[PDB]
Design a protein around this ligand. Structure first.
Ligand SMILES: [Mg+2]
Ligand SMILES: [Zn+2]
Ligand SMILES: [Zn+2]
Lengths: 101, 214, 64, 137, 102, 91, 82, 103
RNA sequence: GCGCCGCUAGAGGUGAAAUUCUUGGACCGGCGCAAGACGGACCAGAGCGAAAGCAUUUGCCAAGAAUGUUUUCAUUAAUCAAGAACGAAAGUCGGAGGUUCGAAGACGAUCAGAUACCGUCGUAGUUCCGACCAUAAACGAUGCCGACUGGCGAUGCGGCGGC
RNA sequence: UUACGGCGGU
């Protein structure tokens, strides 16, 4: 739990409320940093991957470290066919026709 | 409209029993109004006090820190937090045409009080010396600096905090690494420059009340 | 805040000053002790050894 | 009778006084011995209406008077001095309103203990705002 | 013409020195061209010595000094007149001016 | 032989896709296909499985690392600071 | 000094030059006889030694190699030979 | 990280030049069970239960274990050869003092 | 920069001033934490390096001059078309970082005009990694090797000799 | 703080 790790540690997959089994900063390469505990009114703040800092509970359980799979968006998709295969596994959203067209 | 200096009341601050003058001064804090109690509002206040308004004859260029850890009614009882030199003395002793040597070591006592020690020292121009530069060679410095941090490693790791800071008022450590280095190169302004505190051992309340004992 | 309008006798005149030759530095003594003596600047003709009256006594002399 | 500490005639209580005498303004802020509880902060720019004179030595003079007229009013009776410059990246000399705010604090009924310079000196950091060829007036 | 034998700078067996910055104008100068001045000015401003010691809580208090090192670019060393232009034969000396304290 | 002179691994893309984009891939692509020395068995058998998943040819031990390379520089900076915070102050 | 007879120098001036640069060159080394304390064995050790010389029977260390000229370990019996 | 770790591995290649030794796992396991092995050296890289029984046999044979700070490919070049070696056992030091060192 | 307190309306900045920051409490003071740069004073007509260049400690690695030498080899050398290695700062591509400073830019000023100096803010950049680029007032504006030709005091590193 | 110019040949 984030009430025991000291300030400036690097955290992924932290619960946004106690018991939630892990919600914040989950995707590949992201991490969250804890800052500024408050030992009375037990509640700490963190630094999310959007840069938005957010005060959460002090007993939010959370796994130490950064997510594996980082650097994933550095390589270009580089052609339309490998973007077909990228979104075949996710949803039905890929060929986005311009609304002007 | 409202005066905030009516809702404050003056406490008074005590020193450890190892010092001669025991009564430092008079801090103040606001009164208790609901949550804001008048006992955490003044723990952890550092009282940057020198020796000469805390001893009877000892020098003024050495100051101490004395964090409050407890309040016992009106009294505001303190424990040692660190020392350093005043900066006017700290740069009166840094002159040209001498080599300044310094060392540092992280030592804990036998009492659970991990400290960080800073010591300095200056090569000495001799009494019949005619040449202007009394410089040391670099291997002489590396074995002076090895000898400096070796000695205060011992004279903290011997016994508890109470005899280590009491070593400090006397400031012998600097005299001992004075005498034990002048068969390598002669030195003369050899002080423990700054002492910094790193750990507190669980704050046993009986240990503080011994340090404010007889 | 309220000061006495104090009179003070001059020692040696420290020459003219004031970028037009208009002010003279005088070093007055405060008529009750000669150990207390501030350097100040007056305009007009002086005559070493006389007494002039300060409207307010200690502010500033000429130093950059 | 809520204001004033418990002193006899001869015993006096100390508070440190921060003389931040940089350029362009002057602070004659005074506080207690631990340095946490501000007793009376007054500033040289709060007692002129000219803004050239925020760092004038005369503004520092009457700023020291009111902070001595309020300190002595409360029950704190003698002062330690902790003069600053700007320090750090900037200049390290005190401004014009250093000595006059310190001398008027001695003439206007206040006792003085330890004085010590406390301006921030770095261990070689933080490139200075001038450019390379400096400010060219 | 080469004006001075060293080039205004005290480097001989080097290629590069630390650059330092001027005090008032913050200009980048090398450490060995810049005009240095170490100042041991008393912090009490001696006109106000017999005005604070009678307000002191002591009977003999050794006043702290102020320890400021100046170092100037030569563009501001001449303008603030810490150095003066010298004649071409009275120039070949490195000896500092006499002190004259009392 | 010296078969090609600039393109190297991204000659498989041919004359397509751009000049910066083929140049941008040929660092990532030589990185994701390399055999790395395994830190657990010493052999050069860390071959990339799926993205972020790295595996030994012998001793069969799967390490979850970076996407294209075995140690992300952001991962080593964290691990060097995590073990700092564990020993410093001891929580 | 237009008439220094630079074929006949004094031996004092000859001693205080380099070991090269002399009118005839000659080394500043010598050989020395050293009685180690407690044996009959005279050692014939070279002056500017570079090795640690050990004695044969009473095998203690005799000299230490140092910067120019070898420092003998014990204060010992000692003479310059030839 | 500067001057004097030529206590451990420069004494090691000395024994490689002079004395006698075995390299590899099942050679040392034979030498340590018949008492002829004087000092076994493990890598930083060796698997954790293999380390636990070589240390355990040295508890039985009353021999020394040195935990070489280095990889198994780093200990191999420290031997002076192009293998990788996790475990060795020296059975006869030449004239150095690896055994008469710190353990 | 961010917490938590303290007191109060200014703070900043300039030759002056304004843009700006501020009772959702700024500046100031105190204690804590974080991050990235940078190693002050010691620091010199000191030192090393082929040149560029190099300053916080301890520590694996490999190198180097100088000195010492009654060792060794016995001309192996010197300069060098071709061809190579290294090369400040800025610059480019990609990746981490992003405190400070800050091209561009925005605004304030000052000016007859200000696309400038002066001020607030600020992108690229300055920091690390990898790949490039090979130019500088890269200067001692003096190629390298060799010899000879006045003196004096001093310094630095070895060596030797003495109150 | 602001201070910009002065036709050609003799
Ligand atoms: Mg489209
Ligand atoms: Zn300047
Ligand atoms: Zn493997």
């Amino acid at each position: 739990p984030v009430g025991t790790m000291p300030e400036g540690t690097i955290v992924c997959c932290l619960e946004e409320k106690p018991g939630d089994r892990g919600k914040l900063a989950r995707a590949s390469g992201n991490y969250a940093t804890v800052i500024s505990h408050n030992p009375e009114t037990k509640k700490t703040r963190v630094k999310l991957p959007s840069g938005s800092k957010k005060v959460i509970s002090s007993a939010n359980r959370a796994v130490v470290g950064v997510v594996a799979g980082g650097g994933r968006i550095d390589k270009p998709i580089l052609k339309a066919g490998r973007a077909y295969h990228k979104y075949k596994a996710k949803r039905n959203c890929w060929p986005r026709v311009r609304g002007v067209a | 409209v409202v005066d905030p200096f009516s809702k404050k009341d003056w406490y008074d601050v005590k020193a450890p029993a190892m010092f001669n003058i025991r009564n430092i001064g008079k801090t103040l804090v606001t009164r208790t109004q609901g949550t804001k109690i008048a006992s955490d509002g003044l723990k952890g206040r550092v009282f940057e006090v020198s020796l000469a308004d805390l001893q009877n004859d000892e020098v003024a260029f050495r100051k101490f820190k004395l964090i409050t850890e407890d309040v016992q009614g009106k009294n505001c009882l303190t424990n040692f937090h660190g020392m350093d030199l005043t900066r006017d003395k700290m740069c009166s002793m840094v002159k040209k045409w001498q080599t300044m040597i310094e060392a540092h070591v992280d030592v804990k006592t036998t009492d659970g009080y991990l400290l960080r020690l800073f010591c300095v020292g200056f090569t000495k121009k001799r009494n019949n010396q005619i040449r202007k530069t009394s410089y040391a060679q670099h291997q002489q410095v590396r074995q002076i600096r090895k000898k400096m941090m070796e000695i205060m490693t011992r004279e903290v790791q011997t016994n508890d905090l109470k005899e280590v800071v009491n070593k400090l008022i006397p400031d012998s450590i600097g005299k001992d690494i004075e005498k034990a280095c002048q068969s390598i190169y002669p030195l003369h302004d050899v002080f423990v420059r700054k002492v910094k505190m790193l750990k507190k051992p669980k704050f046993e309340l009986g240990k503080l009340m011994e340090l404010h004992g007889e | 805040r309220v000061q006495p309008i104090k009179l003070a006798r001059v020692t040696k005149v420290l020459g003219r000053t004031g970028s037009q030759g208009q002010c003279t530095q005088v070093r007055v003594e405060f008529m009750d002790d000669t150990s207390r003596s501030i350097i100040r600047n007056v305009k007009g003709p002086v005559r070493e050894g006389d007494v002039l009256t300060l409207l307010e006594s200690e502010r500033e002399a000429r130093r950059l | 009778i809520s204001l004033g500490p418990q002193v006899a005639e001869g015993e006096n209580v100390f508070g440190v006084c921060h003389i931040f005498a940089s350029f362009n303004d002057t602070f004659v802020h005074v506080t207690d011995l631990s340095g946490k509880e501000t007793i009376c902060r007054v500033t040289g720019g709060m007692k002129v209406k000219a803004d050239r004179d925020e760092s004038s030595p005369y503004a520092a003079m009457l700023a020291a008077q009111d902070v001595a007229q309020r300190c002595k009013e409360l029950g704190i009776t003698a002062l330690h001095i902790k003069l600053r410059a700007t320090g750090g990246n900037r200049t390290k000399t005190p401004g014009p309103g250093a000595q006059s705010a310190l001398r008027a604090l001695a003439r206007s009924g206040m006792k003085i203990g330890r004085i010590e310079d406390v301006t921030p000196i770095p261990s070689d950091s933080t490139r200075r705002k001038g450019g390379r060829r400096g400010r060219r007036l | 013409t080469k004006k001075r034998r060293n080039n205004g700078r005290a480097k001989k067996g080097r290629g590069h020195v630390q650059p330092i910055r001027c005090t008032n104008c913050a200009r980048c100068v090398p450490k060995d061209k810049a005009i240095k001045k170490f100042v041991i000015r008393n912090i009490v401003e001696a006109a106000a010595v017999r005005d604070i010691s009678e307000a002191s809580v002591f009977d003999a208090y050794v006043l702290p000094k102020l320890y400021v090192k100046l170092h100037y670019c030569v563009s501001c060393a001449i303008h603030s007149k810490v150095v003066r232009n010298r004649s071409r034969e009275a120039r070949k000396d490195r000896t500092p001016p006499p002190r004259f304290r009392p | 032989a010296k078969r090609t002179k600039k393109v190297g691994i991204v000659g498989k893309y041919g004359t397509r896709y751009g000049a910066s984009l083929r140049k941008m891939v040929k660092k990532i692509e030589i990185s994701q296909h390399a055999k790395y020395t395994c830190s657990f068995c010493g052999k050069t058998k860390m071959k990339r499985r799926a993205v972020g998943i790295w595996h030994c040819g012998s001793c069969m031990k799967t390490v979850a690392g970076g996407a294209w390379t075995y140690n992300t520089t952001s991962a080593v900076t964290v691990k060097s600071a995590i073990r700092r915070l564990k020993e410093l102050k001891d929580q | 000094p237009l008439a220094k007879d630079l074929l006949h120098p004094s031996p004092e001036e000859e001693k205080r030059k380099h070991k090269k640069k002399r009118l005839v060159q000659s080394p500043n080394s010598y050989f020395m006889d050293v009685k180690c304390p407690g044996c009959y064995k005279i050692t014939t050790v070279f002056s500017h030694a570079q090795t640690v010389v050990l004695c044969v029977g009473c095998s203690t260390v005799l000299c230490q190699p140092t910067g120019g000229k070898a420092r003998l370990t014990e204060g010992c019996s000692f003479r310059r030979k030839q | 990280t500067k001057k004097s770790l030529e206590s451990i591995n420069s004494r090691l290649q000395l024994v490689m030049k002079s004395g006698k030794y075995v390299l590899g796992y099942k050679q040392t396991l034979k030498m340590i069970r018949q008492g002829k092995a004087k000092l076994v050296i493990l890598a930083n890289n060796c698997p954790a239960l293999r380390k636990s029984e070589i240390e355990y046999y040295a508890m039985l044979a009353k021999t020394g274990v040195h935990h070489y700070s280095g990889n198994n490919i780093e200990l191999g070049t420290a031997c002076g050869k192009y293998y990788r070696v996790c475990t060795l056992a020296i059975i006869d030091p030449g004239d150095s003092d690896i055994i008469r060192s710190m353990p």
